[PDB]
Amino acid sequence: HMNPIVVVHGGGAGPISKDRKERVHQGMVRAATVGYGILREGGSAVDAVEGAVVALEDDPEFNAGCGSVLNTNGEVEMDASIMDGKDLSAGAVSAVQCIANPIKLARLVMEKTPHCFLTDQGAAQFAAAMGVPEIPGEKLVTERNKKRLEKEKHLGTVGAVALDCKGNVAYATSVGGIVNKMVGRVGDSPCLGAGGYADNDIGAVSTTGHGESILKVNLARLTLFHIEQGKTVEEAADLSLGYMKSRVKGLGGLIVVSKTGDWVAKWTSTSMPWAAAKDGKLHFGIDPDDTTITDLP
Amino acid sequence: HMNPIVVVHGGGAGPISKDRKERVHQGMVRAATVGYGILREGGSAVDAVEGAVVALEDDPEFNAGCGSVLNTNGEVEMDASIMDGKDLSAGAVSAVQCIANPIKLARLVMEKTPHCFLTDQGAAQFAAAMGVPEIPGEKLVTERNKKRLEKEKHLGTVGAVALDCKGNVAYATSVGGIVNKMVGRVGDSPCLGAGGYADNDIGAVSTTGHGESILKVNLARLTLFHIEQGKTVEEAADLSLGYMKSRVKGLGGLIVVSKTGDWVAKWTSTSMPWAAAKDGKLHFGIDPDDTTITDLP
Ligand code: NA
Ligand code: NA
């Protein structure tokens, strides 16, 4: 059986402040801690990526769930998806409002409907009916995000991949969008093959950065194509990310794990917080080269 | 310069009665001739694919625009997408209501927003900002639609790919939902790489079978991976369709036009209505190896 592996990512975007750096650290760490806690106790890849992504959604330092930005009309609007590498089982939700954890709702889409993708109105019904709490859209709206809303008038995709004890792979990704965005814009995060792809015959990818560009070039699926062509995880990351930059002038990041347990985190944005838990050991960083490898207690 | 072509398809579905084949074969001819006419006046591939699909949307018989099948509330939700193969720009709407031409709105997302994808109430609010008329839903519904859902409480996706004389390729798709589909169920159509994909350096594909299977295997972008690798377009379609078959037990079909100008219509479903125009001729079918060929005025 395989040594489990989990990689976790936040925004593939600009420079981070030294203050937010350490706190970005703690949310990635908690995230990756949780996914790996789930796997070392017999949980699946889906199990791992779901708990991993739930962690970052709950945390207000990241732009999915609570800590999600507000669109141009003063409300949070969220996207998320998740996928089983085993049979390509998937679930996706877009422009969902007023719920704590869209990745969970994404999971229900997959496992309890004959469909993969629900949006806005019907999503919330599906939620409502599956028992998911509604909450006043007040409690998903933090202090510092209405500020950047105003600021911009005149914090990118988070995600997770795993390979579990029994060789299954998965991803999950979730976001609150770009700030002051128009009503109902949908990025890459609920679009299979762009925000993520998982396939037990190749590996799992989650993406971050410019949604539109990630969408145009089907970035996750593309990364896996290079891997099928027999390229290493890094080479394939490099080739896909390079193409996105050269073909549509788009920037971002990606985490990937091949079906053999090989993994890489790579980005073309200035920065991408990431962490990987494997072999009871934690890898973490934000800036290229900045990385550390610590002991997992 | 290149000789231009348009290919259209109706839905990759089960057996079709004599009583419809006649209304459908005519419909397919009209769409091809609309898009070919645009190609005849040196129009863009993107103009032509929009036109053909508009025709199919406006034909009450096709599951798109007028004649869209009904959801669980007896209501009309539609998806669409367009992509321009020159710079991969794209436009898409999911779960839109009370508009005549979803595909024309997707083009308005391509050209007139920073984004590639709008959904539901955003998509509604944009359609206004652009003075797209709020049209009654009983105009969209038919006594096929009304009479189908009532007892389903107990056809398919249309598209076109075009190559213009500049060598540019493009795809369009539209679909009006599924009989008794969950409200807010989004399918393959608005998902770039799934329902379709267009790139001048390979070609363009528009797919049509079972939406979830298409999403799960990224069928449109899959087909293009194979052309990238040396397959002919007929080989490409055969393998991508066969992979969706063996792996996800899903049936459907697609149309593809290459950057070289080689074209094909292929399906694992029983039928898939289709039509093509190239070098003064119109090519057509529904069921296998039955290609009717005639001149175009
Ligand atoms: Na958060
Ligand atoms: Na129609």
Curated annotation (Swiss-Prot), chains A, B:
Consequence recorded when altering T157S: Strongly reduced enzyme activity
Expression triggers: By 5-alpha-di-hydrotestosterone and progesterone.
Gene Ontology molecular function terms on file: asparaginase activity; beta-aspartyl-peptidase activity
One GO term describing the cellular component: cytosol
N-acetylmethionine, modified sites: M2
GO biological process, one term: asparagine catabolic process via L-aspartate
Role summary: Has both L-asparaginase and beta-aspartyl peptidase activity. May be involved in the production of L-aspartate, which can act as an excitatory neurotransmitter in some brain regions. Is highly active with L-Asp beta-methyl ester. Besides, has catalytic activity toward beta-aspartyl dipeptides and their methyl esters, including beta-L-Asp-L-Phe, beta-L-Asp-L-Phe methyl ester (aspartame), beta-L-Asp-L-Ala, beta-L-Asp-L-Leu and beta-L-Asp-L-Lys. Does not have aspartylglucosaminidase activity and is inactive toward GlcNAc-L-Asn. Likewise, has no activity toward glutamine.
PTM entry text: Cleaved into an alpha and beta chain by autocatalysis; this activates the enzyme. The N-terminal residue of the beta subunit is responsible for the nucleophile hydrolase activity.
Species for this entry: Homo sapiens (Human)
The protein's name: Isoaspartyl peptidase/L-asparaginase
Reaction(s) the record says it catalyses: L-asparagine + H2O = L-aspartate + NH4(+); Cleavage of a beta-linked Asp residue from the N-terminus of a polypeptide
Highest taxon, organism lineage: Eukaryota
Quaternary structure and interacting proteins, as annotated: Heterodimer of an alpha and beta chain produced by autocleavage. This heterodimer may then dimerize in turn, giving rise to a heterotetramer.
Location(s), subcellular: Cytoplasm
Database matches in Pfam families: Asparaginase_2
Family designation: Belongs to the Ntn-hydrolase family.
PANTHER family to which the protein is assigned, alphabetical: ISOASPARTYL PEPTIDASE_L-ASPARAGINASE (PTHR10188:SF41), L-ASPARAGINASE (PTHR10188)
SUPFAM superfamilies hit by this protein: N-terminal nucleophile aminohydrolases (Ntn hydrolases)
Keywords noted in UniProt: Acetylation, Autocatalytic cleavage, Cytoplasm, Hydrolase, Protease
Binding residues for substrate: R185, V186, G187, D188, T208, G209, H210, G211
Active site location: T157 (nucleophile)
Tissue note: Expressed in brain, kidney, testis and tissues of the gastrointestinal tract. Present in sperm (at protein level). Over-expressed in uterine, mammary, prostatic and ovarian carcinoma.
